[PDB]
Amino acid sequence: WVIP
Amino acid sequence: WVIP
Amino acid sequence: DSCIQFTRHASDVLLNLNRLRSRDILTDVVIVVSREQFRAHKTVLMACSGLFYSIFTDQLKCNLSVINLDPEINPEGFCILLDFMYTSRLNLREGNIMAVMATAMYLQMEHVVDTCRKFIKASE
Amino acid sequence: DSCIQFTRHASDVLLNLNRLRSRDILTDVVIVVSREQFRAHKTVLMACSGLFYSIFTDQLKCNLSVINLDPEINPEGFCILLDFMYTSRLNLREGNIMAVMATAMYLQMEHVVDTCRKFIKASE
Ligand SMILES: O=C1Cc2cc(Nc3ncnc(Cl)c3Cl)ccc2N1
Ligand SMILES: O=C1Cc2cc(Nc3ncnc(Cl)c3Cl)ccc2N1
Ligand SMILES: [Cl-]
Ligand SMILES: [Cl-]
């Protein structure tokens, strides 16, 4: 999971 | 395009 | 093999599937979550959820145009997960995390359940 | 927004759509290319090709279960492009590049046409  |  | 790979292809496909969903093009099922209705593509639901995969591979349920979810399922939690299925983006907030995690557990979306568990553990 | 994004989601969706195609699950169209037949999902074809997008948004053609391609279309070139649609991997070889490029031009798959043009230009 990432900060887009 | 890339070499997978 | 000796194939070449187009890096953005999967993301471009998913973006177009979401555009078809937004315009209600070739949607073949309505998911009923209490008073709320959500139109979608059976194939995308199966590709994202262990529960939908089981439902639409069933020889009788594969032909249903309406699927009713368990009354304990929160429509907002479902909406957030449906948006995630079609975009890869999860709108996870303090106010919805419990409903999102419960819905992801029911839908069998293990990566979502995992991030919800980690976000909750951090707040404890 | 304040969304989180699952990096591998689009690729995982496409992998599952290809697994459904391989098991012939919820395929809703057969593409006829001379003597050869290819089963697929209309939504994936539309998401990958300008030609299929135009065909399946047409109020009469959207309901057809069989689509016949132009007789000049090579079945192997189509097979290679159908595999690319479902995997992001293009099996481009000296022996098939001309057929693949002609099929990609007909199907309106601009990224494939672009790489074929570059590979041909390099060999000149
Ligand atoms: O957490 C998850 C996400 C998910 C999706 C699916 N889907 C598929 N799996 C295998 N082959 C096929 Cl053909 C599909 Cl469609 C099944 C289980 C789970 N669990
Ligand atoms: O080279 C290409 C690949 C491609 C795909 C599509 N597909 C879609 N485009 C916009 N909205 C929607 Cl809803 C879809 Cl399905 C249209 C044109 C082209 N050209
Ligand atoms: Cl997931
Ligand atoms: Cl393309």
The shortest C-alpha distance from C106 to chain D (Å) reads 19
Determine, for residues D7 and A1 on separate chains, whether the beta-carbon distance falls below 8 Å.
yes
Q: What residues have CB less than 8 Å from C114, skipping those under 6 apart?
A: none
CB-count exposure of residue D77 (10 Å: 0-12, 13-18, 19+):
buried
Going by C-alpha positions, the residue among C35, C33, C32, C23 that lies closest to residue C86 is: C23
Question: How far apart are the C-alpha atoms of C39 and C17, rounded to whole Å?
Answer: 13
**Cβ contact C31:C69 at 8 Å:** yes
Tell which one of D42, D53, D57 to mutate to probe ligand 2, the residue whose CB is within 8 A of the most ligand atoms: D53
Query: What are the distances in angstroms from CA D64 to CA C41, C52, D31, D50, D67?
Result: 18, 26, 11, 18, 7
Experimental determination technique = X-ray
> How does DSSP classify residue C15?
H
Question: How far apart are the C-alpha atoms of D21 and D105, rounded to whole Å?
Answer: 24
Both tokens of D31, joined, read 């593409």
Range of the domain at C108: 1-124
Question: What is the DSSP annotation of C22-68?
Answer: HTT-S--EEEEETTEEEEE-HHHHHHH-HHHHHHHTSTTGGG-SEEE
Question: How far apart are the C-alpha atoms of C13 and C43, rounded to whole Å?
Answer: 13
Question: What is the DSSP annotation of chain D?
Answer: ---EE-TTHHHHHHHHHHHHHHTT-S--EEEEETTEEEEE-HHHHHHH-HHHHHHHTSTTGGG-SEEEPPTTS-HHHHHHHHHHHHHSEE---TTTHHHHHHHHHHHT-HHHHHHHHHHHHHH-
Q: Count the domains in chain C.
A: 1
Q: What residues have CB less than 8 Å from D76, skipping those under 6 apart?
A: D96, D99
Task: Say which residue the tokens 């809703």 belong to.
Answer: D28
Question: Which strands sit side by side in the sheet containing D66-68, from one edge to the other?
Answer: D36-40, D29-33, D66-68
Residue D120 β-bridge partners: none
Q: How far is the CA of B1 from the centre of ligand 2 (A)?
A: 19
D6 touches chain A (CB under 8 A): yes
Both tokens of C122, joined, read 């951090």
Give the CATH number of the domain where residue C10 resides.
3.30.710.10
Q: What residues have CB less than 8 Å from C29, skipping those under 6 apart?
A: C39, C40, C41, C42, C45, C64, C65, C66, C67
Residue in C closest to A1 by C-alpha: C115
Ligand nearest to the CA of D88: 4
